[PDB]
Design a protein around this ligand. Structure first.
Ligand code: NA
Ligand code: NA
Ligand code: NA
Ligand code: NA
Ligand code: NA
Ligand code: NA
Ligand code: NA
Ligand code: NA
Ligand code: NA
Ligand code: NA
Ligand code: NA
Ligand code: NA
Lengths: 170, 170, 170, 170, 170, 170
């Protein structure tokens, strides 16, 4: 997992290592040890609206790799890697400070399904609202809290990827 | 579905017709027509912490049959019937007025797993907290709202079953 | 199953009794006997791109009830009923003569997901192409064959529902 | 469920109403009330090697309808009906006396997969051994016990169907 | 898999690499090659009552790493790692000599669900009885046999972890 | 994944690294990076009739490792390895030239289920016909095409493994 590239051509052509599939049981996996760890069994009765993972060889303003949600037509396996392109970013804050969750779709080479989704406005509204709801509430029953600020666009997402890839010094 | 009895011996020995399994996809089934209808695809990214259905031949102070959640070791099929016994009731309110969701376990004849669960205090705390969280939030993305008041005990649940069975005049 | 209405307000507000879920194992259920029968285990290694069923109290120009595919965000259970609205119809022929498979989305009351899908052009192209492919090929390994003609619009679908409801004399 | 025929042409062409799918979670459904009931959550950590149900309008020497296991390439839904043909019968005894579990395959009209399975010798040995093991052990953790005697052939199965259909007086 | 630590703080704070999820299909995975191998398709129609794996960098009195079952609210993926704490150990014998299967729960950091389970008496009786039944019978249809002796407590489990970690010389 | 052996004893005793399980969702995984990548979401509404992967340290006349389908009683996880033995090979062509898909069963040590399957004639006809159908059609909705030639026997499969293992120079 340490050796997966951030992307073929940052910031628009990235690899996301998926930790948690969309619509899965409430097991919060995290890739550590070179291993898929169980970080927690999520306490709230919720599921991730899209697959959740990160871009390797990035360092977010919060100390871990940059987080990314990837929309797919079928949930992918934990630990699998998906070639993707960013379409937006959700800004938030928690008990540990600021955070952002990018939103991405699979690269055109993987599927024609998202050929008309190029920026955050193109993503179905209900899915965005569900991602917001999830991040507002998923920690409600964990000493952990979350405040969600709002969406920014694909340029802002690409900016996050550039910043975080530059910050990585490993 | 019209012809399923409320129970072998109300209020402590009931039948619950299950509409929605625990931990299922967000399809909100309702038994109508003598049919399992799709009432809605739930908008919020949540799941029912326990199986959800109702007692036939009851009329809740809200116009439909009395609602009951049934804890089981494995989610049951929509449309199946489970012989159960009440252990508590969760009181709430919504856009249509007052409401209550009973909590029950399968009858002893079905499983020895719940032999030590006789009242609401005996139910695992996290499961209660998850049921509360679910009812507080499940309608967040639907013109529909919900305020949750709190738990009452097995006697209060049995009282709800008596009241609702008396109210049924069909 | 005999007693489910064709719809609240034909032709635009219908009920579809689902026989086969989208993306399911290759069991071709049919509602008979008032029962969910197994008609066949499908020989070809394919799945239905959308839920498949029929409108009760209709008689298609082919002798059985009018067939309808219903797009949903999650596959529904066999034997469940979904309130739906037509968006198009796929015309074809087989070893028994002409046939048509309507395409529908859930009624607005069930979900906001399809508020912008009002006619066949609004349906994602790949999904249409997959439905075509499925009907072209699903009988390839069964003495049964199928020739697919092409899509017609929501008005043509509504016309099929009117014709078939009129033809029903039961 | 009361109104499903025993078969198109007994004893070789039967209908089996399935209660429990092959390879399913340990929920022991039974068709009652015209309803799919949960009879028990099975205590032993086992699964049915083949779908399990019964032939309607039969009365086994044990007081309930004749029991039948149906081999299929994919587990079927509880409550569905499968047109089948008998290939053997497993004789046993329990806390309530003698019992027999027929073994059947889907009718040729449903699948070509079993065209070479006409009697008990033709059934894969491991599957037979697993069905034996299951019936020997499934009640180990329930005041209920079971002794398994052995297989008899398709003629003996057909004989069981004739006897049980004659015994039904409802 | 070779490089996963035995634990943060043996013997009470361990890592278990899971090979087989609870309630899964009968595929007996084993971690080898640095790979998840299929060791066998289990012949008996049974499932593991809890997730099954081992502690890395241990050597059991039987030649392979120390075996551990981990109770979780949802089955975890094969190949994932769970931080756990021992609560008991099941002693047995087979065709190759003595053996022991530890029982553990996830560490408090992963879930509050097991805060009241500190020793073997606190584990639900039926689950213990099912684990016993499984180990008594899972090899019934494999030239392989098993005799189960009985449970010992959390101190005995911790003793097994100490012994086995000391024995590892790799 | 780079370090998994081709086999214990080529050509009859091989290891297949599985990329795509039988009967799975249409995610076309490929093992790359030492990683399970998503190569594509398959456009056609089809599934693999048997698990699909490759033999490591082989080079097919087409530039990648030799492809193998492995029949199992339960689909295995992507990324798992199965010890297998060849029973036949399906010859074909595509947009990139000639290709072959071996067919194999698990080694006897893993299961007794295939003890009577030693060559291609012994494999169930419908399964062969489904594998043919799948390879004829799976690329129908992808600028990619496929022409299927026909089956050859277990000796021809073993010949393919010898040729491809010799060709590997890594
Ligand atoms: Na972050
Ligand atoms: Na919190
Ligand atoms: Na209510
Ligand atoms: Na609302
Ligand atoms: Na038709
Ligand atoms: Na045909
Ligand atoms: Na019987
Ligand atoms: Na017993
Ligand atoms: Na051991
Ligand atoms: Na044995
Ligand atoms: Na190839
Ligand atoms: Na093509």
């Amino acid at each position: 997992y340490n050796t997966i590239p951030a992307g073929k051509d940052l910031p628009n052509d990235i690899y996301v290592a998926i930790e948690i599939p969309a619509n899965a049981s409430p097991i919060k996996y995290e890739i550590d040890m070179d291993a898929l760890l169980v970080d927690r069994f999520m306490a709230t009765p919720m599921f991730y609206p899209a697959n959740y993972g990160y871009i390797n060889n990035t360092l977010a303003d919060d100390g871990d790799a940059l987080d990314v949600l990837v929309i797919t037509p079928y949930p992918v396996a934990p630990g699998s890697v998906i070639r993707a392109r960013p379409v937006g970013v959700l800004k938030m804050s928690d008990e540990a400070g600021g955070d952002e969750k990018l939103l991405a779709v699979p690269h055109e080479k993987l599927t024609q399904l998202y050929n008309d989704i190029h920026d955050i406005d193109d993503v179905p509204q209900l899915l965005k609202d569900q991602i917001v709801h999830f991040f507002e509430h998923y920690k409600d029953l964990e000493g952990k809290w979350v405040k969600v600020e709002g969406w920014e666009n694909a340029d802002a997402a690409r900016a996050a990827i550039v910043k975080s890839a530059a910050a990585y010094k490993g």
